[PDB]
């Protein structure tokens, strides 16, 4: 995508050498923002083939408030294997904070339902927020939330959403983080009878790993193709009733996939 | 300031009519980001006189973990009077979340000290974050945090900071939110022996109230003056030991102040 490739070029031209936790260096910039008008089409990177299958199951899993990978395994989705323990537990990550944020007084807060209530009853609210940054449970999580905080907004019958991502691997992580939240905006809007608006991506430490230089130059030489269109085949009774097969992406014609290896 | 006036013009040209909770309409945009190189000077609006006295005491108060306005009153700072109850309590707002985020297991998390520890021991960390968005305590707060979440970043000996502000009154709130966090970046950097870098402001619902149109046009006709320089007179033993008199702003020559009335 145009916005995506411009970011890639910006990290190359303006990034500072910065080390990560494993010791692999990165080229990093701090603070960036991109906007995607969802009416122009589904924001799925075309300059390299992205497989949506995993994204969709992962999102459905988050909505379930599930933090054990069993559901992912029944569908042979292995993207969280790296972090799970022998029982397949990840600790109180995303889904748990979204659906059951624990309070000091013994309650569990359903932020997803809270957000739906606000979108239907008080759409002008400037506090329609979901946060996975639960300070008191950070130590128990396999990993600290990257996509930590997001806010919804309604104006003229259009649902917009801004995500704050504290850390971002532009090559390997970003394509998937964008498609994931754009998808959630489409589900949310369908359930609230609103049109889709903008998905605003805001990043903190936005970077490219130094061992991904050839892959980046290769993708930077490719030309963006038309964006696909997302179609939701049915309208479930609630946000927790979607199923994998309800979604179809039409018109997605990507350039070949590029492999990016990681150090251990 | 240039970035500030450009935002003001953008809300006028691109904002959508949106109602707020009191019923006063606003012109609103969603998602905006500005960057301030703190080495270029202290980001205090010059196209209208801003009084830093209140900003400074409020910040010192936040750092104390104090949520009762008594300290503000001893210094005749009344900016929180509107929200306090008869005892002068605001509930678990900013200072309490910053210094004593309560966990379900009975602990109180000092996010400010946590952040200092990381800046000194693990400066490359991509998780140096402070959040006031404590979902479990929102109902008890006089008001939901506007400046909800911020992240620090170190690269080449420079301390940068990005604030996520969910809601923003460009005329009345913004000048003060910027100066407040820029000040905190200077204190933080002094305590960690780092140079100051960039303060990145990211906003959610960014707006101007409709009864502030004349004031906005008046400020938009003024020319930005040189930015002042902040000087910190001494180096306290810790981040909790600053005092009002440690700060001096030099070279601040603002245009006259503009009053903006609010509906009740
Ligand atoms: O959804 C995700 C999850 C992780 N990352 C990246 C950012 C980093 O390169 C790494 C996490 O490192 P820490 O940031 O946490 O340290 O993975 C993403 O880009 N997106
Ligand atoms: O630090 C602050 C605190 C409040 N506001 C503004 C944003 C809104 O105009 C109002 C809060 O309204 P709600 O957003 O909460 O609804 O005050 C700021 O700009 N800055």
Closest ligand (CA of A176): 1
Residues 6+ apart with CB under 8 A from B152: B115, B118, B119, B128, B129, B159, B160, B161, B188
Cβ A234 vs Cβ A244: under 8 Å? no
| Structure tokens that stand for A207 in this block | 């970077």
CA–CA separation, B44 vs B224, rounded Å? 10
CA–CA separation, A255 vs A262, rounded Å? 22
Pocket of ligand 2 (CB under 6 A): A 126-127; B 21, 144, 146-147, 167-169, 173, 177
CA–CA separation, A19 vs B126, rounded Å? 10
| Structure tokens that stand for A1 in this block | 């995508």
The reply to whether residue A104 touches residue B136, judged by beta carbons under 8 angstroms, is yes
CA–CA separation, A139 vs B83, rounded Å? 34
The DSSP element (H or E) to which A243 belongs, if any, is: none
Torsion angle in degrees (nearest 10) through CA of B237, B241, B246, B252: 120
Q: How many CA atoms lie within 13 A of A94 on its CB side?
A: 17
Residue B91: CB atoms within 10 A of its CB come to 16
Cβ A44 vs Cβ A175: under 8 Å? yes
CA–CA separation, A183 vs A163, rounded Å? 13
Which A positions 170-229 lie with beta carbon below 8 A of chain B? Answer: 198, 200, 202, 204-205
Residue A164: CB atoms within 10 A of its CB come to 25
Q: Report the catalytic residues of B.
A: 146
Residue A68 DSSP symbol: B
Residues 6+ apart with CB under 8 A from A44: A50, A52, A175, A178, A179, A227, A228, A249, A252, A254
- Of A206, A42, A182, give the one whose Cα is nearest residue B155: A206
Cβ A37 vs Cβ A245: under 8 Å? no
Q: How many CA atoms lie within 13 A of B226 on its CB side?
A: 8
Report the atom number in ligand 2 closest to the C-alpha of B174. Answer: 19
- Of B161, B131, B149, give the one whose Cα is nearest residue B36: B161
Longest dimension (CA), chain A: 55
Closest to A204 (Cβ–Cβ): which among B106, B162, B198?
A: B162
First-last CA distance in chain B? 30
Output Rg (C-alpha) for chain B, integer angstroms. 18
Which A positions 88-117 lie with beta carbon below 8 A of chain B? Answer: 101-107, 109, 111
CA–CA separation, A213 vs A211, rounded Å? 6
Cβ B119 vs Cβ B141: under 8 Å? no
CA–centroid distance, A12 to ligand 2, in Å, is 37
Residue B35: CB atoms within 10 A of its CB come to 15
Cβ A14 vs Cβ B155: under 8 Å? no
The reply to whether residue A160 touches residue B30, judged by beta carbons under 8 angstroms, is yes
- Give buried/exposed letters for B144-176 (b at 16+ CB in 10 A, else e): bbbbbbbbbbbbeebbbbbbbbbbbbbbbbbbb
The domain spans of chain B are: 1-264
Which A positions 31-70 lie with beta carbon below 8 A of chain B? Answer: 31-33, 35
| Solving technique | X-ray
| Structure tokens that stand for A169 in this block | 């691997």
How many interface pairs between A and B have CB atoms less than 8 angstroms apart? 133
- Of A149, A152, A98, A150, give the one whose Cα is nearest residue A124: A152
What CA–CA distances, in Å, run from B96 to B61, B99, B113, B132, B134? 10, 5, 13, 8, 10
- Beta strand extents in chain B (DSSP E only): 16-19, 25-37, 101-102, 108-109, 129-131, 147-155, 158-169, 195-209, 229-232, 247-250
CA–CA separation, B41 vs B33, rounded Å? 19
Quick check: CB of B126 below 6 Å from ligand 1? yes
| Structure tokens that stand for A187 in this block | 């589900």
């Amino acid at each position: 995508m145009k916005q995506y490739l411009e970011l890639m070029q910006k990290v190359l031209d303006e990034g500072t050498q910065k080390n990560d936790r494993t010791g692999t260096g990165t080229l990093s910039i701090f603070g960036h923002q991109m906007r995607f008008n969802l009416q122009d089409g589904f924001p799925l990177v075309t300059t390299q083939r992205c497989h949506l299958r995993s994204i969709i199951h992962e999102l459905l899993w988050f909505l379930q408030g599930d933090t054990n990978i069993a559901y992912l395994h029944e569908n042979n989705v292995t993207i969280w294997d790296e972090w799970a323990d022998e029982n397949g537990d990840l600790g109180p990550v995303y889904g748990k904070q979204w659906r059951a944020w624990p309070t000091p007084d013994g309650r569990h807060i359903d932020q997803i339902t809270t957000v739906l209530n606000q979108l239907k009853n008080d759409p002008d609210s400037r506090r329609i927020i979901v946060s996975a940054w639960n300070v008191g449970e950070l130590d128990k999580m396999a990993l600290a939330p990257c996509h930590a905080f997001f806010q919804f907004y309604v104006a003229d019958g259009k649902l917009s959403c801004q995500l704050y991502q504290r850390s971002c691997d532009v090559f390997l992580g970003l394509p998937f983080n964008i498609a994931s939240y754009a998808l959630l905006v489409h589900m949310m809007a369908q359930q609230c009878d609103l049109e889709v608006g903008d998905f605003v991506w805001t990043g903190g430490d936005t970077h490219l790993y130094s061992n991904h230089m050839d892959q980046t130059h290769l993708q930077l030489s490719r030309e963006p193709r038309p964006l696909p269109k997302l179609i939701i085949k049915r309208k479930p009774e609630s946000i927790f009733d979607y199923r994998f097969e309800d979604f179809e992406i039409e018109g997605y014609d990507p350039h070949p996939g590029i492999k990016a290896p990681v150090a251990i």
